[PDB]
Write a protein that binds this ligand. Sequence first.
Ligand code: BCB
Ligand code: BCB
Ligand code: BCB
Ligand SMILES: C/C=C1/c2cc3[nH]c4c(c3C)C(=O)[C@H](C(=O)OC)c4c3nc(cc4[nH]c(cc(n2)[C@@H]1C)c(C(C)=O)c4C)[C@@H](C)[C@@H]3CCC(=O)OC/C=C(/C)CCC[C@H](C)CCC[C@H](C)CCCC(C)C
Ligand SMILES: C/C=C1/c2cc3[nH]c4c(c3C)C(=O)[C@H](C(=O)OC)c4c3nc(cc4[nH]c(cc(n2)[C@@H]1C)c(C(C)=O)c4C)[C@@H](C)[C@@H]3CCC(=O)OC/C=C(\C)CCC[C@H](C)CCC[C@H](C)CCCC(C)C
Ligand SMILES: CC(C)=CCC/C(C)=C/CC/C(C)=C\CC/C(C)=C/CC/C(C)=C/CC/C(C)=C/CC/C(C)=C/CC/C(C)=C/CC/C(C)=C/CC1=C(C)C(=O)c2ccccc2C1=O
Ligand code: HEC
Ligand code: HEC
Ligand code: HEC
Ligand code: HEC
Ligand SMILES: CC(C)=CCC/C(C)=C/C=C/C(C)=C/C=C/C(C)=C/C=C\C=C(C)\C=C\C=C(/C)CC/C=C(/C)CCCC(C)C
Ligand SMILES: COC1=C(OC)C(=O)C(CC=C(C)C)=C(C)C1=O
Ligand SMILES: CCCCCCCCCCCC[N+](C)(C)[O-]
Ligand SMILES: [Fe+2]
Lengths: 250, 323, 273, 332
Amino acid sequence: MYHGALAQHLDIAQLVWYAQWLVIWTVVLLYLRREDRREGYPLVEPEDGQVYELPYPKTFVLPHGGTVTVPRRRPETRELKLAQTDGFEGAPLQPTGNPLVDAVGPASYAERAEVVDATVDGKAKIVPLRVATDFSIAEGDVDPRGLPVVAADGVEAGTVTDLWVDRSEHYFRYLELSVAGSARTALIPLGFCDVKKDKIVVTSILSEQFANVPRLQSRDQITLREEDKVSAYYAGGLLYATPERAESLL
Amino acid sequence: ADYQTIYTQIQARGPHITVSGEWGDNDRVGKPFYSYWLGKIGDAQIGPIYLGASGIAAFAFGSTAILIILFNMAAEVHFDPLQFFRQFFWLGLYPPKAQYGMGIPPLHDGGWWLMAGLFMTLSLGSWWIRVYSRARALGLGTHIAWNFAAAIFFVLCIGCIHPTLVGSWSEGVPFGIWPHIDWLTAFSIRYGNFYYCPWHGFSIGFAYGCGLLFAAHGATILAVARFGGDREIEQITDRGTAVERAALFWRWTIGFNATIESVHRWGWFFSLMVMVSASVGILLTGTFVDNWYLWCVKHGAAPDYPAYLPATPDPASLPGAPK
Amino acid sequence: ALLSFERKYRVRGGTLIGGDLFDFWVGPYFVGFFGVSAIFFIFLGVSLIGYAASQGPTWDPFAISINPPDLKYGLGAAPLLEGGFWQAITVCALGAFISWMLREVEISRKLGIGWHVPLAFCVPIFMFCVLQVFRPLLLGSWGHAFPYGILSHLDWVNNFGYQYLNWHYNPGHMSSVSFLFVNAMALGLHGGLILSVANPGDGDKVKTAEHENQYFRDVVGYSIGALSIHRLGLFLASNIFLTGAFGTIASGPFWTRGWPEWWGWWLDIPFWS
Amino acid sequence: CFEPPPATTTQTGFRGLSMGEVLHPATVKAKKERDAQYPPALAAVKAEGPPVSQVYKNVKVLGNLTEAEFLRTMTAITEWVSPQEGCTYCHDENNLASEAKYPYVVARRMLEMTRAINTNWTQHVAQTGVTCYTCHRGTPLPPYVRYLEPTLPLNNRETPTHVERVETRSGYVVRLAKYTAYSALNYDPFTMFLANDKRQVRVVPQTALPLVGVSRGKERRPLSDAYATFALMMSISDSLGTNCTFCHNAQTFESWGKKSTPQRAIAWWGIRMVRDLNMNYLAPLNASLPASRLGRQGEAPQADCRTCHQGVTKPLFGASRLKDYPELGPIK
Ligand code: BCB
Ligand code: BCB
Ligand code: BCB
Ligand SMILES: C/C=C1/c2cc3[nH]c4c(c3C)C(=O)[C@H](C(=O)OC)c4c3nc(cc4[nH]c(cc(n2)[C@@H]1C)c(C(C)=O)c4C)[C@@H](C)[C@@H]3CCC(=O)OC/C=C(/C)CCC[C@H](C)CCC[C@H](C)CCCC(C)C
Ligand SMILES: C/C=C1/c2cc3[nH]c4c(c3C)C(=O)[C@H](C(=O)OC)c4c3nc(cc4[nH]c(cc(n2)[C@@H]1C)c(C(C)=O)c4C)[C@@H](C)[C@@H]3CCC(=O)OC/C=C(\C)CCC[C@H](C)CCC[C@H](C)CCCC(C)C
Ligand SMILES: CC(C)=CCC/C(C)=C/CC/C(C)=C\CC/C(C)=C/CC/C(C)=C/CC/C(C)=C/CC/C(C)=C/CC/C(C)=C/CC/C(C)=C/CC1=C(C)C(=O)c2ccccc2C1=O
Ligand code: HEC
Ligand code: HEC
Ligand code: HEC
Ligand code: HEC
Ligand SMILES: CC(C)=CCC/C(C)=C/C=C/C(C)=C/C=C/C(C)=C/C=C\C=C(C)\C=C\C=C(/C)CC/C=C(/C)CCCC(C)C
Ligand SMILES: COC1=C(OC)C(=O)C(CC=C(C)C)=C(C)C1=O
Ligand SMILES: CCCCCCCCCCCC[N+](C)(C)[O-]
Ligand SMILES: [Fe+2]
C-alpha cells in the first residue's frame, strides 16, 4: 500500500495532471484569448460566433477626466485611397494617389484622440525646449540645434531648430526642423534620425518630401493623433519614398 | 534602423519628478543623482530610495540570515580568512544530515540552518509587504505583489513545506553557491529523475515561454518605437498605429494576436506559472510520488530504447551474488 | 475577415523576393515567397516525422522518438531507419525556421516597422544550430545531435549533462541559467507593472508614466524606464542562448573533464593552494 | 583551462542518447606511457627439481614451484614492489628465510591477496587479473591509497602543500572536494562506502508511489544518503577517468537491464572486491607496519578504485601478466 493511490489504479498525481491542463486551457482560451479581442473586433464583413469570442467591456477611468470603454465598435469611415490589384479575397490593395499624403499602407495613422498628451499634473507632455526651458541636452551629447538635416537623396532639407521633450519620462521624442524654402517648420521622430556631430541624416524620405510632413495645430504642442500622423509619414517613406522601395530587395 | 532602440542618442535632463503616495513621502531618503552611461540604455536617475518600516525589517532579518550563514561558512574553513575567500563557492550551511524527523535538530547538525531558514523567510515576507503596499500607496493594482507571492511560496516549498510533508528536515536546500546546486541533483536522483516529473515540464515550459515572450514582446515594442509603442499605458487607453502595426505583425505571422494590454497579461501569467507549476510538482514529490520516472512508466509515457551494449542484469539479484 | 483597423495596412510590397507573385494573404496569414517555402518545409518535415514514427515501436506521443545515426557514421548520410529520417527532418526544420524568419522580415517591411522580431528570432535558431550542427561538426558526427521526441530529447539532455559529471558547474550554463531566471522575473515585473497601472481597480483612475517609474524608484532605488525595459527584456532573454551557446559548444570540443574540475583554475592558484 | 580539439568520443548507449566516453587524446597518450612502464614478463624458466616446500626453510605460500620458477617470481616481485631497493628490501642479504624485516611478513599477506583477487574476484578482474605492479607501480608504497579521512595530494608521490596536509584544519573542504571530482559534496565516499560494508549504495525508490510505512518522518533515509551516493559516483567516475554514461543511462540511474552497460555490473563486483580487500587484508596490516605508515587513527592505508585504475577505465589499459606468472592466480 502506497501514499497517493486512489481506487482502480488512479493516483493523486494523475488527477492533478488533468486538473493542470484544465486550469491552463481555461486561462488561455476562456480568459487571455478573449482579452486579446478588446481591440479591432468584431471583424469587418449578428452571428453566434462573435458574441462568444469577446469579453464584457471593461471601462478605463482616465486620469485627466473621462472614460474609455473596450471593446467598443469603432468604424473606420475615413476615406482610403486604395484600389485592388486583383479579384480574390486575399489580394493586396495599393495606393491610387500619393500614399504618404493620403495616409495608406505603412504610412497610415490611427484615429487617436484629437487630444494633447498630459503630464501627471496637466502641463502638455510633449513640448519643445523653448517651452520646457528647465530641461537641457545632457552633459556631453550632440546639440542638434543648428545642424543641417540631410534627406535620403543626400540633399540638405532644413535646419534643426528645436528638440521636443517628453516631460513625464525625460526623453527626447522629436526634432523640429525648418523645411528649406517652404516657410514652415516640421517635426521628425528621433527614431528616424541618425544624429551625427555635424548633421542629422534621415533616410525615411527624400528632401523635397519634407514639404508635406503633416503640420501641427498649435505650434508649441502636439496631439496624440498628430503624433501618429507625423510618425506615420516618415514610416511611409521606407516603402514609398521611391518607386523602387516597394519592389523586392533581392 | 532606429538607433534609438539601440541606445539613446541625445539624453535629456530636467527636474526630478515625484509622485506623491498616500503615505511615507517622508521616508524617501537620498540625493537623486544621475549617470551619463546608465543614460545611454536606461534612465540616468538613481535614487532616491524609499525606506519604510517593512523595508528596514527585511534588511534586519535578511542580514541576520546572511550572518548566520556566512559565519557557519567561516567556521567551515576554521576561520582562516584567506581560505574562506578561496573556497567560497564550496562552502555551505547544511540542513540536518541525520534523521531527526520534524524535531528541532542540534545546532551542530542543521540547527543553524533552520535558524537562517527562518530569518530568510521573515526577510522575504517583510519585503513582500513593502512590494505590496508601495502599489497601494501609489494607487496601483497589486499584480506585482501577487506574482511575487508565487515566488516566495515556491521557496517555502523547497525550503520547509516539502520537508514537513515528508516529515524530515534533511530534505531542505543548503545555503551556499555550489552546495545549493548540489541539492538539485541529490533531489532529482532521490525522486527518480525530475525530467520525468510533469510539473518540472510545466515549469520549464513556462520559463522558456517567458524567454520566448519577453524576447518577442520586447522586440515588438522596439520595432514600433518610431510610433511611440513604448508609451504603453496610453496605447492601452487610446490604441494607436504603434500597437496596430504590432498586432498586425503577429496576426499576419502566426494567425492571431493580442492587444498591447493583453500581452502583459500573457507575460504576467507565464511568469506566475513557472512558480505555481514548480510548487505543484514539489508538493507532490515525496508525498504522492516516489520515482517520477517509474510513474511515467506506470502510465506508459516513458520511452524505451533497444540495447546497444548488451543489456545488464542487476547482479545483486543473481543466484550466488553476495551482500 | 479583417480586423476593424486592418484594411488600410494591407498594401502590396515589402517582400524580399518574388514581388507581387506571392504577395497576398490567406486568412489572417501573409504568404510571400518565404511563406511558400516555409509551408513546403513544414509539410516534408511533418511527413518524414509521421512516416518514420510509423516504423517506430509506439504511437504514444510521449514515447515516439526519432534518433540520429550512431557515432560510427560520422558526418556522412545514414540509412533511413538508422538515423536517415532524423537527418532529413533536421534539414527540414532548418529550412522551415529560416523561411519563417525571412517571412517575418517581409511582414515587418510591409508594416514599415523594425526588423527586431525576425532578428531576435535568430537567437533561438542559432542555438538550435549549435546543438544539431556546429557541435556535431566539431566532434565529427551527426550522432551527437539530440533525438526528436517529446520525452526522449530530455533523455539526451540528461545524459549529455552527466557526461560531464555535473553540468551545473559549467560556467556557460551558470550564465545561461541566470539569464533564464532573471528574464522570467523581469517579464513578471514588467507585465505586472503595466497591468498594475491600467488596472488599479475599484474604478480608481488609470495612472501615469510618472507612476510607473515612481513605483520602482521607491521599491529598489532605480527605475529603468518604459522603452528601456523593453530593450533590457530582449537583451536578458536573448542571452539565455547567446551565453549558453558557449557552455554547449565547449563541452567536448574544448573540454573533456567534469565541469566541477574546471574550477581548478580558481581553486588551484598556487598562491592559496 | 580549455583543452584543444579534437576529442575522442565513444558510444555506450543507443544512438541519440548522448551516452559515451569523451577523452582528450593528449591525456590518454600520457597515461598510456605512464602505464607502459609495466616491465615485460621475465623469460620462462622450465619446471625442474623438487617443490621448494622442502628445499627452502620458510616458504608458506609459493611452495609448489621449482627453485627455477620460485626465483623468477622473486625477480618479478622485485621489479614490481622495490626495483630501487633490490631484494634486501624484505630479506636479510645472508638470512633469506628470515622474517626479520617487516616487508617480509606483509609481502606474504599481499601474496595471498593477489592470489585471492585473481581466483575469487574473476567477476571483476577476469582474464587480466592483478599483480603487485597494478598497485605498487615500482614503489613499496603504492601511489594511491586512502586513510580514514580524506588526504592530498591523491598521488602521495608528490609533496603536500601546507593546506593539503591533513593537520591543516582549514584545508578540509578542499581535500574532500578533490576526492569527489571537485564537487562540493560534503561526504567522504571512501570511509562511507569503501572501507567496510556498513552502508548501502542504492537510494532511489523502486516503485512509482511512496511505499507506506517507510515514507514518513523518522522512518525515512535522510536526503543526505542521496548526496553521499552521488559523491561515491563522482569519485568512482574520476577514479576510472570516465563519466556516468560509461555505466548508466541517466534516464534511470536505478534501473539495470537495458539501462545499464555491462561495465556497470563489473563495477558492482568491484565495490564488493574492494570491501573484501580492505576489511580482510589491508586493514588488519595495521598491527604489522611501522606506526609511521599508519594514519591519524592507526589505520593501515587501504584501497579505492583509483589504487588500481589510476585514472584509466581498465587498469594499465588492460595489460596483463596472468599467464606469465600463474602462481598469482587463479589457484587451480
Ligand atoms: C539543450 C536543452 C534542450 C531542451 C530541454 C528541455 C527541457 C528540460 C524541457 C523541454 C520541454 C519542452 N521542449 Mg525541449 N525542445 C522543443 C520542444 C519542447 C516541448 C515539447 C516542451 C515545452 C517547450 C516550451 O514550452 O517552450 C516554450 C514555448 C512555448 C510555450 C510555445 C509553444 C511551443 C510548443 C509547446 C512546442 C511544440 C512541440 C511539439 C510537440 C513538437 C513539434 C511538433 C512537430 C510535429 C512539428 C523543441 C521544438 C526544441 C527544438 C526545436 O530544439 C527543443 C530543444 C531543446 N529542449 C534543447 C535540446 N525541453 C519541457 C518538457 O516538458 O518536454 C517534454 C521540459 O521540461
Ligand atoms: C539533475 C537535477 C535537475 C533539476 C532539478 C530541479 C529541481 C529539484 C527543481 C527544479 C525546478 C525547476 N527547473 Mg530543473 N530544470 C530546468 C528548469 C527548471 C525551473 C523552470 C524550475 C523552477 C526552479 C526555479 O525557477 O528557481 C529559481 C527561482 C527561485 C529559486 C525563486 C526565488 C525567488 C525568491 C522569492 C527571491 C529571494 C532572493 C533573496 C533576495 C535572497 C536573499 C536571501 C538571504 C537573506 C539569505 C531546465 C530548463 C532544465 C534543463 C534544461 O535541463 C532543468 C533540469 C534539471 N532540474 C535537472 C533534471 N529543477 C523546480 C521545479 O519546478 O520542480 C518541479 C525544482 O524544485
Ligand atoms: C543532468 C543534465 C542537466 C542539464 C543539461 C543541459 C545541457 C546539455 C544544456 C543545457 C542548456 C541549458 N539549460 Mg540545463 N538547466 C537549466 C537551464 C538551461 C537552459 C537555460 C539552457 C539552454 C536551454 C536550451 O538549450 O534551449 C534550446 C532550445 C531551442 C534551440 C529552441 C529552438 C527554437 C526553434 C528555432 C523553434 C521551435 C520550432 C517549433 C518546432 C515550432 C512548433 C510548431 C507549433 C508550436 C505551432 C536549469 C534552470 C536547470 C536547473 C534549474 O537545474 C538546468 C539543469 C540541467 N541542465 C541539468 C544539470 N542543460 C543548454 C546550454 O546552454 O548549456 C550551457 C545545453 O546545451
Ligand atoms: C518567474 C518569476 C520569478 C520571480 C518573481 C519575482 N521576484 C521578485 C519579485 C517578483 C514579482 C518581486 O516583486 C521582488 C522585487 O523586489 O522585484 C524588484 C522580487 C525579488 N527577487 C529577488 C531575487 C530573485 N528572484 C528570483 C527568482 C524569481 N523571482 C522567479 C524567476 C531569484 C532566483 C531564481 O535566483 C532571485 C535571486 C530580489 C531582487 C527581490 C526580493 C527582495 C528581497 O526579498 O530581499 C530580502 C531582504 C534582504 C535584506 C536581502 C538583501 C541583503 C543585501 C546583501 C544587503 C545586506 C548588506 C548591507 C547593505 C551591509 C550593511 C553594512 C552596515 C554594517 C554599515
Ligand atoms: C532566447 C530567445 C528565444 C525565443 C524567441 C523567439 N521564438 C520565436 C520567436 C522569437 C522572437 C519568433 O518570432 C517565432 C514566433 O513566431 O513566435 C510566436 C518563434 C517561435 N518559437 C517557437 C518555439 C520555441 N521557442 C523556444 C525558445 C525561444 N524562443 C528562446 C527562449 C522554444 C524552446 C523549447 O525553448 C520553443 C519550443 C515557435 C512557437 C515559433 C517558431 C515558428 C516556426 O518555426 O514555424 C515553422 C516551423 C514549424 C511551424 C514547425 C517545424 C516543422 C519541422 C519541419 C519539423 C519539426 C522538427 C523538430 C526539430 C522536432 C522537435 C522535437 C521536440 C520534441 C524536441
Ligand atoms: C500535412 C501538413 C501538416 C502540412 C501542412 C502545413 C500547414 C499547417 C499549412 C497550412 C496551409 C495554409 C493555411 C496556407 C499557408 C499560409 C501560411 C504561410 C501560414 C502558415 C500557417 C502556420 C504554419 C501557422 C502556424 C503558426 C504558429 C507557428 C503559431 C504558434 C503560436 C505560438 C505557440 C507562439 C507562442 C507565442 C505566444 C504565447 C503568444 C501569445 C500572445 C501573443 C499573440 C503575442 C504576440 C504579441 C506580442 C508578443 C506583443 O508584444 C504585442 C504587442 C502589442 C500588440 C500585439 C502584440 C502581440 O500580438
Ligand atoms: C616482496 C618483498 C620481497 C622481495 C622484493 C624479494 N623477496 Fe624473496 N621472499 C619474500 C617473501 C614474502 C617470501 C616468502 C615466500 C612465501 O612465503 O611463499 C620470500 C621468500 C624467498 C626465498 C625463500 C626463503 C627460504 O629459504 O625459505 C628466497 C630464496 C627468496 N625469496 C629469494 C629472493 C630473491 C632472489 C629476490 C630478488 C630476485 C627476492 N627474494 C626478492 C619477500 C621478497
Ligand atoms: C589491491 C592493491 C595492491 C596489490 C595488488 C598489492 N598491494 Fe602491496 N600494498 C597495498 C597497500 C594498500 C598496502 C598498505 C600501504 C603500505 O604499507 O604501503 C601495501 C603494502 C605493501 C608492502 C609494505 C609497503 C611499506 O613499505 O609499508 C609491501 C612490501 C607490499 N605491499 C608488497 C606487495 C606484493 C609482493 C604484492 C604482490 C603479491 C602486492 N603488494 C600487491 C596495495 C596492494
Ligand atoms: C564505473 C561504473 C559507474 C559509473 C562511472 C557511475 N556509476 Fe552510478 N552506479 C554504479 C553501480 C555498480 C551502482 C550500484 C552500486 C551498488 O548497488 O552497490 C551505481 C549506483 C548509482 C546510483 C544509485 C541508484 C539506485 O539504484 O538507488 C545512482 C543515483 C548513481 N549510481 C548515479 C551515478 C552518477 C551521478 C554518476 C556520475 C557522477 C555515476 N552514477 C557513475 C556504477 C557506476
Ligand atoms: C584490485 C585492483 C582493482 C581495484 C581495487 C578496482 N579495480 Fe576495476 N578493474 C581491475 C582489473 C584488473 C580490471 C580488468 C580489466 C579487464 O577486464 O580488462 C578492472 C576492470 C574494471 C571495469 C571494467 C572496465 C571495462 O572497460 O570493461 C570497471 C567498470 C571497473 N573495473 C570499475 C571499478 C570500480 C568502480 C572500482 C572501485 C569499486 C574498481 N574497479 C576497483 C582492477 C581493479
Ligand atoms: C520552527 C522554526 C524554527 C522552523 C521553521 C522555519 C522555516 C520557515 C524554515 C524554512 C526555511 C527555508 C525556506 C529555507 C530555504 C533556503 C533556500 C531555498 C536556500 C537557497 C539558496 C541559497 C543560497 C544560494 C545562498 C547562498 C548564500 C551565500 C553565498 C552567502 C550569503 C550572501 C549573499 C550575498 C546572498 C546571495 C544573494 C544572491 C542575489 C546572490
Ligand atoms: C514598465 O516599465 C518598467 C520600468 O520603468 C518604468 C522599470 O523601472 C522596471 C524595473 C527596473 C528594474 C531595474 C528592475 C520594470 C520591470 C518596468 O517594466
Ligand atoms: C507547456 C506550457 C503551456 C503553454 C501554453 C502555450 C500557449 C499557446 C496558446 C496558443 C493559442 C492558439 N489559439 C489561436 C487557439 O488561441
Ligand atoms: Fe511592454
